[PDB]
Design a protein around this motif. Structure first.
Motif, PDB file in Angstrom:
ATOM      1  N   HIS A 161       8.162   2.353  -1.534  1.00 40.01           N
ATOM      2  CA  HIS A 161       7.945   3.623  -0.874  1.00 40.01           C
ATOM      3  C   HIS A 161       7.219   3.349   0.437  1.00 40.01           C
TER       4      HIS A 161
ATOM      5  N   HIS B 185       4.406   4.956   3.697  1.00 40.67           N
ATOM      6  CA  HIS B 185       3.375   5.852   4.234  1.00 40.67           C
ATOM      7  C   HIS B 185       3.603   5.905   5.739  1.00 40.67           C
TER       8      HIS B 185
ATOM      9  N   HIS C 166       5.437  -0.292   0.983  1.00 42.30           N
ATOM     10  CA  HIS C 166       4.844  -0.875  -0.225  1.00 42.30           C
ATOM     11  C   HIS C 166       5.935  -1.171  -1.236  1.00 42.30           C
TER      12      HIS C 166
HETATM   13 ZN   LIG Z   1       1.796   3.054  -1.202  1.00 37.23          ZN
END
Ligand SMILES: [Zn+2]
Length: 259
Positions: A93, A95, A118
């Motif tokens: 995923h 950010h 990540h």
């Molecule tokens: Zn993360």
């Protein structure tokens, strides 16, 4: 305020109320002070073995979007580096920010990148991810910075399906995606003991943060910023600034794999 998020009334400064470990001794992310990180010649090269990865689904989970993998066999595994044993890829995923000057969770000499990828892996010696998050060496998260410049061709398949998962709860088939296309050239890294950067903030992660960012285009990250935090039918709130700020290092040591 209430269920956690990134807003004024439910964001990172509120999380400690439901998750008191938020003020713990090994929280993430952190600022990586490059001049203080010590080169450790005893570290191994990272072994990233993603040839047999089997992606399953892509999901807007209300906080980010994720691509999930089959973790029921040792297909896509992370080993070596600072790790003892074998860690299975569960998902990745991102950010990201509202503008290119913020979005990463880790920082490098206080520099914020536009986004951070990540790849979350769990230690096979604990059998499943739920057991692994209860252990200090349960998870290994490979973190990769994104800067804005040239497009990353290996990201485009992800970008192009985001319009189908705009709002919380939406998912889609996302098979045959090769996460090798998201990796930079170099596997030089920093490593330190830390935590999940979202609730439950469990102190179960060996962080491996690559030094070399990948470049993505402005059009690619603009498509991230069209995602919505909200569910369909609720007031539209752009999924942007879904990052936790740097937390106190507290006498942990960040080690470098490179000189
Ligand atoms: Zn993360």
């Amino acid at each position: 305020s209430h269920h956690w998020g990134y807003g004024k009334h439910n964001g990172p400064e509120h999380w400690h109320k439901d998750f008191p470990i938020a003020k713990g001794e090994r929280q993430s992310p952190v600022d990586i002070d490059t001049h203080t990180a010590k080169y450790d010649p005893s570290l191994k090269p990272l072994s990233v073995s993603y040839d047999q990865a089997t992606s399953l689904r892509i999901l807007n989970n209300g906080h980010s979007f994720q691509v999930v993998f089959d973790d029921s066999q040792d297909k896509a595994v992370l080993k070596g580096g600072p790790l003892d044993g074998t860690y299975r890829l569960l998902q990745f995923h991102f950010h990201w920010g509202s503008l290119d000057g913020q979005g990463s969770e880790h920082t490098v000499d206080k520099k914020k990148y536009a986004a951070e990828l990540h790849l979350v892996h769990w230690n096979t010696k604990y059998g499943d991810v739920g057991k692994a998050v209860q252990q200090p060496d349960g998870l290994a998260v490979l973190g990769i910075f994104l800067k804005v410049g040239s497009a990353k061709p290996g990201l485009q398949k992800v970008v192009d399906v985001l319009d189908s998962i705009k709002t919380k709860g939406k998912s889609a088939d996302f098979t045959n995606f090769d996460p090798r296309g998201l990796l930079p050239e170099s596997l030089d890294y920093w490593t330190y003991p830390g935590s999940l950067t979202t609730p439950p903030l469990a102190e179960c992660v060996t962080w491996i943060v690559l030094k070399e960012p990948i470049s993505v285009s402005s059009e690619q990250v603009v498509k991230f910023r069209k995602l919505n935090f909200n569910g369909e039918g609720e007031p539209e709130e752009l999924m942007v600034d879904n990052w936790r700020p740097a937390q106190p290092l507290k006498n942990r040591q960040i080690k470098a794999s490179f000189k």
